[PDB]
Design a protein around this ligand. Structure first.
Ligand SMILES: [Br-]
Ligand SMILES: [Br-]
Ligand SMILES: [Mg+2]
Ligand SMILES: [Mg+2]
Ligand SMILES: [Mg+2]
Length: 295
């Protein structure tokens, strides 16, 4: 169902001097849920219950996000993709996941998840994805309604828009959920970014990392790598499509529909679809996991 209550309490692990937070409930092979920008593990709160009894349910908060520690010094060079991967790879190793991991990913969580699967293919039992960064794109592929704002985040205007005005959290997030959020839900997303300044840097560094029109070249190369691999991988996949959707539409959606060994369902939503159709999403992930883990 819908609801504002988190799925569980946060557990903490020390990673490279910083404490990272994650939800970890149940037992069995992992079903790893990874949020993107400007969210946290909270994004999956109404989806994880659907997998009760199917495995160890885990949802990690990326560095500087959710209840994971902020990095200091922080500035324009902090929280780039590579730095996030460095912290997340270490946390996932620390969690002792074994080799039958089912990844459930969204947004930057999909870029990080796809990248890790390419690099640990024998340990991935299945991949469920939605509103993902499935390949490098062009501005023409970006949702029309937010094109100017994302170009502004990528310009020097980004610091005022995000560090001072907190626009990713206050405008983009609610703007890409079809239903109105309650104060408790909005408070849960605002919490890590309440303080003006560098505390909000992760929500500004992330849009500056999207592989668009070949820039930044390093992330474009990384996405090109996992896109090519996923398109040829026999790993079971579940494509949770959205209507109207946002990022995984047009060319990117056509590309994803070519991936092999894939099941598809479509749910109502824009970008943060977990807030609009959690039960339909959770039920399909549960059906997928039951096929992968015949009891
Ligand atoms: Br972003
Ligand atoms: Br570049
Ligand atoms: Mg500490
Ligand atoms: Mg905090
Ligand atoms: Mg389009």
């Amino acid at each position: 169902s819908l609801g504002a209550k988190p799925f569980g309490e946060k557990k903490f692990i020390e990673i490279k001097g910083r404490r990272m937070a994650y939800i970890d409930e149940g037992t069995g092979d992992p079903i790893l849920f990874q949020h993107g920008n400007p969210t946290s593990s909270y994004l999956w709160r109404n989806i994880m219950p659907h997998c009760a009894g199917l495995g160890r349910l885990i949802a990690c908060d990326l560095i500087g996000m959710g209840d994971s520690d902020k990095l200091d010094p922080s500035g324009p060079e902090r929280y780039a993709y590579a730095e996030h991967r460095d912290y997340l790879d270490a946390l996932w190793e620390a969690l002792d996941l074994g080799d039958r991991v089912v990844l459930v990913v969204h947004d930057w969580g999909s870029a990080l998840g796809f990248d890790w699967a390419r690099r640990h293919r024998e340990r991935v039992q299945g991949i469920a994805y939605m509103e993902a960064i499935a390949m490098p794109i062009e501005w023409a592929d970006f949702p029309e309604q937010d094109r100017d704002l994302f170009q502004a985040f990528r310009s020097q205007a980004g610091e005022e828009l995000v560090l001072q005005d907190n626009v990713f959290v206050e405008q983009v997030l609610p703007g890409l959920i079809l239903r109105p959020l309650s104060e408790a839900e909005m408070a849960a997303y605002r919490e890590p970014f309440l303080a003006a300044g560098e505390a909000r840097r992760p929500t500004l560094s992330w849009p500056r990392q999207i592989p668009i029109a070949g820039t930044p070249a390093d992330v474009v190369a990384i996405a090109r790598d996992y896109a090519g691999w996923l398109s040829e991988s026999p790993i079971p996949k579940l494509f949770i499509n959205a209507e109207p959707g946002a990022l995984t539409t047009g060319r990117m959606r056509d590309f994803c529909r070519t991936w092999p060994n894939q099941t598809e369902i479509t749910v109502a939503g824009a970008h943060f679809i977990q807030e609009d159709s959690p039960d339909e999403i959770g039920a399909a992930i549960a059906a997928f996991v039951r096929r992968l883990r015949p009891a």
